[PDB]
A paper describes a structure:
The tumor suppressor p53 acts as a DNA sequence-specific transcription factor regulating and activating the expression of a range of target genes in response to genotoxic stress. This in turn initiates a cascade of signal transduction pathways leading to different cellular responses including cell-cycle arrest and apoptosis that are known to prevent cancer development (1–4). p53 binds as a tetramer to specific response elements consisting mainly of two decameric half-sites separated by a variable number of base pairs. The majority of tumor-related p53 mutations, particularly those defined as mutational ‘hotspots’, occur within the DNA-binding core domain of p53 (10). R273, a DNA-contact amino acid, is one of the most frequently altered residues in human cancer (6.4% of all somatic mutations), with mutations to histidine (46.6%) and to cysteine (39.1%) being most common.
In the case of R273H and R273C, it was shown that the replacement of threonine by arginine at position 284 (T284R) restores activity to both p53 mutants. The crystal structures provide high-resolution information on various R273-related mutants including the oncogenic single mutants: R273H and R273C, the rescued double mutants: R273H/T284R, R273C/T284R, R273H/S240R and R273C/S240R, and their complexes with DNA. A superposition of the mutant structures onto one of the wt core domain structures shows that their 3D structures are similar to that of the wt protein, demonstrating that mutations located at the protein surface have a negligible effect on the structure of the protein. Similar geometrical features of the protein surfaces are displayed by the crystal structures of the single mutants: R273H and R273C, and of the double mutants: R273H/S240R, R273H/T284 and R273C/T284R in the absence of DNA. The mutation sites of these proteins are compared with the corresponding region of the wt p53-DNA complex by modeling the central A/T doublet as shown in Supplementary Figure S4, confirming again the inability of His or Cys residues at position 273 to interact with the DNA target. The arginine side chains of the second-site mutations in these structures (T284R and S240R) display a range of conformations in their free state, but a single conformation is observed in their DNA-bound state. Reactivation of these proteins is achieved by new interactions formed by the second-site mutations, T284R or S240R, with the DNA backbone.
Numbering used by the authors: 96 to 288
Write the structure that this text describes.
Amino acid sequence: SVPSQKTYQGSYGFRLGFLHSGTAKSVTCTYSPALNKMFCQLAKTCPVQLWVDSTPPPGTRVRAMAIYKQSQHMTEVVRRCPHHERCSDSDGLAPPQHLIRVEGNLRVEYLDDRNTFRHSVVVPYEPPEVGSDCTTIHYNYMCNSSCMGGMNRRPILTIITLEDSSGNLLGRNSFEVCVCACPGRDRRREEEN
Ligand SMILES: [Zn+2]
């Protein structure tokens, strides 16, 4: 019933990478390789890189979806808290309830699953930019992890899926995410164990 989170590289050798951003006070987004966990700020650019060994055809799509990490909460749909959804932060594309947005891509598509009610955001796959070995997507997380009513400090996974134009699954990967005021300090803190 719960969406699969099993890693699969598949035919194209698909995996994720992240900027090596460090943990200074001013970083807005920082990834910990030890924890496989992203720490980022509400509404700020969160670059996720897509790495492939061979190029997928045009038509290929890239989906992102959040699920709760813990088993007791896994079947609960991850959505925004009431204070955040019912606030004028819309971009005219994203449904107000969706945690994950994509910025700087007018081909963005949002889905409420007709059967699971789960939210996801999908953008066209595009090959790497000139002078770059990966494809970057800028995600936005629109709720703090601390938001009472929403996640309420409960840890979440973001699952990134590569799909062909006909919806066939090509590859999958995932990472944990914390949305917080001081990503840098918080990453340092959580690695201390
Ligand atoms: Zn919130």
